[PDB]
Amino acid sequence: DGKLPFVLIPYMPVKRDMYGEPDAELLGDNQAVLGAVMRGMIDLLGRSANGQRGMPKGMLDALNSRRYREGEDYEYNPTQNPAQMIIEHKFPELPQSALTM
Amino acid sequence: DGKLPFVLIPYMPVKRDMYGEPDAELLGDNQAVLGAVMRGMIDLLGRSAN
Amino acid sequence: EWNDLMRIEGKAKPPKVKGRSQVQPKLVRRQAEWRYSALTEPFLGSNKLFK
Known part of the structure; x- marks a missing residue:
């Protein structure tokens, strides 16, 4: 052949240059932004707290509180409705902006 | 044959290397996150009381 | 730097903070995966490589 035995193959050729540009050159910022959102x-x-039970004080007496904790029927003071009480923390709803971004 | 009788078969080949990468390499974080949600x-x- | 973006090893590595997640989606790697099979397949589609 009489010349060098090496062959150069660029991915995205650069104007009047040997080494090309890979796809990682254009996605530097996008990957970092995506990682922050995730x-x-x-x-x-x-x-966030999950599975924890919060009970207002004074709603149940000493005996009734134990029965509720043991899975049996109980009686409560009518002044406080357990429906709005007995907070059961769960996962907060994900904002729509994060999915959009 | 005159050479070693062993044959190497990689799953996902690594550039200039023998041992390949299995699918478990890329799904390490995804499985852990999925397990936490479940x-x-x-x-x-x-x-919860029922 | 380009190799540090294909895999999360170099500057792209998220900082290690206690009590917070350290995951990092591989956006660059995902793009490369769909390119490897697309380009390698035509060369291996026939028994003869050179015509």
Whole structure:
């Protein structure tokens, strides 16, 4: 052949240059932005309380409170409705902006 | 044959390397995140009075 | 730097903060995966490689 035995193959050729550009050149910012959104969604769910029960004080007497905790029928003071009480924390709803972004 | 009798077959080949990468390499984080959500749903229902 | 974006090893690595998630989706890797099979397949579609 009489010349160098090496062959150059660029992916995206550069004007009057040897080395081409890979796809990672254009997606540097997009990957970083996408990573921030995903971590934010996990932190919102992960750090949030889940499965914990909150009971207002004075709604149940000493004996009735134990029976409720043991899974039996109980009686409550009518001044406080357990429907709005007995908070059962769950995962907060994900904002629509995070999905849109 | 005059050479080693072993044959190497990679799943996802690595650039200039023998051992390939299985699918478990890319799904390490996804499985852990999915497991956390499933356990949270069960805990909410299981611990709730019914 | 380009190799540090294909895999999360270099500057693209998220900071390690206690009590917060450290995951990072592989946007660059996903694009490359759909390109490997697309380009390798035509060369391996026949027993003869050179005509």
